[PDB]
């Protein structure tokens, strides 16, 4: 669920664990303090999340990565197009 979800209420996942909320948080506390799953639960509104905070270097870095992939794909298209024309309109 931490792999798929982003932010979730306390009671929903407590129900999905078939056990009480206090047991849920007491069981995940020793998990998070062992640095195996990252979570920052709030015990005032019953809202918990994963989603590590965002750093400026990361945002535009991933933006540049997407640009790189786009350039590679648009470069690869043309050769395939050319070999498509070659077998039909060469003669």
């Amino acid at each position: 669920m931490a792999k798929y979800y982003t932010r979730i209420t306390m009671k929903r996942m407590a129900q999905l664990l078939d056990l009480s909320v206090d047991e849920s948080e007491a069981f995940l506390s020793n998990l998070v303090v062992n640095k195996t799953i990252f979570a920052k639960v709030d015990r005032l509104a019953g809202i918990i999340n994963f989603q590590r905070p965002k750093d400026p270097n990361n945002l535009l870095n991933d933006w540049s990565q997407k640009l790189n992939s786009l350039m590679s794909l648009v470069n690869k298209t043309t050769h395939l197009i050319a070999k498509e024309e070659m077998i039909h309109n060469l003669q």
């Binding site: 948080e25 995940l28 506390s29 303090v33 639960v41 709030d42 015990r43």
Partner: protein, 53 residues
């Protein structure tokens, strides 16, 4: 000589335990943390004020 260092060792261990129990989450009531550390509320409040200062 053990009784000379027992109090200081207890205080240091209390600090460690409090930081451990606060660590796993964020904004929370004082009643829950007092129940977790089985102490009163006023002393926990003063300890938190000293730590944050």
């Amino acid at each position: 000589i053990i009784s000379t260092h027992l109090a200081k060792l207890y205080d240091n261990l209390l600090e460690q335990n409090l930081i451990r129990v606060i660590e796993p989450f964020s904004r929370v009531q004082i009643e829950h943390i007092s129940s977790l550390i089985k102490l009163s509320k006023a002393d926990v409040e003063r300890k938190l004020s000293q730590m944050i200062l």
